[PDB]
Design a binder for this molecule. Structure first.
Ligand SMILES: Cc1ccccc1-c1ccc2nc(N)c(CCC(=O)NC3CCCCC3)cc2c1
Length: 367
């Protein structure tokens, strides 16, 4: 796994991408790592923002599937032609597989101008693959056609970001302390149940069903910790309270404006804790984030990285960047451990702790 360490790059706010190759001879593309979709899609036309793109005409192992795909989103969309070809990951396991590839021939508000990536690797489940669940996601394919075990892990390290994606195992030097696993409520997104939220060790005092409405997910494809509406009201109310010492433009708590400091009063900001449903009946654990997780640097200035959401809780790069996250697909469970590469300070750290006793955890999901 020393092979796979530090195999992720990116730029702040612009996702984490991994080098891959497609076709024979191999064509190298930077592909964005996304645990919140399930399509493998790449630029196949010379869009102006792209450094490079998939040239099917160059590939002896390309097979057309004579079948289009449309994928719209809030703003924008991408459109492609479906096909398969030989795919490998240079700094991954030492194999090559045939997987589905959507060749993007038309997009709109998909590619980022100035970014250094050219496609997306959907690592979530077939249930949200477009056009429908019959398009076997890349990871499914890899596990079938090789002896690579059904799991991966992500250490996202935080204008230039880095990280590690360990495919097919765990690297114990990427985390400290112990791994705690919450279960994957259903194999579509990486869906989890959150059963408590504290701040500096103080309950937010809400029905737990409100933390997970209409779902909670683990998503390397999102930047912010995104909480739902109700939860977000209550959570800002309490961070503002803990940091009365200084006051801030009542728009900044919406990411609109960024606050600056010379040469930054860390102790003024609370730790957040999420309790997640555990492996055992009535048992939970909690993950704790420092302010240096939800206050991210720009270019000493900082963006407020917790957002109003309306499609549920999303534990994005803000959460994930403090922890080593294990996507134990084999045993329908997600693992969290304190990352070796998260930013500390003198007096406090991020933490993964348990066990705790929590009754009626089922009643936290939506139906
Ligand atoms: C920017 C965009 C422009 C046009 C076409 C798609 C996208 C796009 C691409 C990848 C994404 N990945 C993510 N993780 C998220 C956040 C959560 C989410 O809604 N995920 C997806 C579920 C599967 C189907 C698409 C949405 C959003 C994404 C949006």
């Amino acid at each position: 796994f020393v092979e796979m360490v530090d195999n992720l790059r990116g730029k702040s706010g612009q996702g984490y991408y991994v080098e891959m190759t497609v076709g024979s001879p191999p064509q190298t593309l930077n592909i964005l790592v996304d645990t919140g979709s399930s399509n493998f899609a790449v630029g196949a036309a010379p869009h102006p923002f792209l450094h490079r793109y998939y040239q099917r005409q160059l590939s002896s192992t390309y097979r057309d599937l004579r079948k289009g795909v449309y994928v719209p989103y809030t703003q924008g969309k991408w459109e492609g032609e479906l096909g398969t070809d030989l795919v490998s990951i240079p700094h991954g396991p030492n194999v090559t597989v045939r997987a589905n590839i959507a060749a993007i021939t038309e997009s709109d508000k998909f590619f980022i101008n100035g970014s250094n990536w050219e496609g997306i690797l959907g690592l979530a489940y077939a249930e949200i693959a477009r056009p429908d669940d019959s398009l076997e996601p890349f990871f499914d394919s890899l596990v079938k056609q090789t002896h690579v075990p059904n799991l991966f892990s992500l250490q996202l390290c935080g204008a230039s970001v880095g990280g590690s994606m360990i495919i097919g195992g765990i690297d114990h030097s990427l985390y400290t302390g112990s791994l705690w696993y919450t279960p994957i409520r259903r194999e579509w997104y990486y869906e989890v149940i959150i059963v408590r939220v504290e701040i500096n060790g103080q309950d937010l005092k809400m029905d737990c069903k409100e933390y997970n409405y209409d779902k909670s997910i683990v998503d390397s494809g999102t930047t912010n910790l995104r909480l739902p509406k109700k939860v977000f009201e209550a959570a800002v109310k309490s961070i503002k309270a803990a940091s009365s010492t200084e006051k801030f433009p009542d728009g900044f708590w919406l990411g609109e404006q960024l606050v600056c400091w010379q040469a930054t009063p860390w102790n003024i900001f609370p730790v957040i804790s999420l309790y997640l449903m555990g492996e055992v009946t009535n048992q939970s654990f909690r993950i704790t984030i420092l302010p240096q997780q939800y206050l991210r640097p720009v270019e000493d200035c900082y963006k407020f990285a917790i957002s109003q959401s309306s499609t549920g809780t999303v534990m994005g790069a803000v959460i994930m960047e403090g922890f080593y996250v294990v996507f134990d697909r084999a045993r329908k469970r997600i693992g969290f451990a304190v990352s070796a590469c998260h930013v500390h300070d003198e007096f406090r750290t991020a933490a993964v702790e348990g066990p705790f006793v929590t009754l009626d955890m089922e009643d936290c999901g939506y139906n």
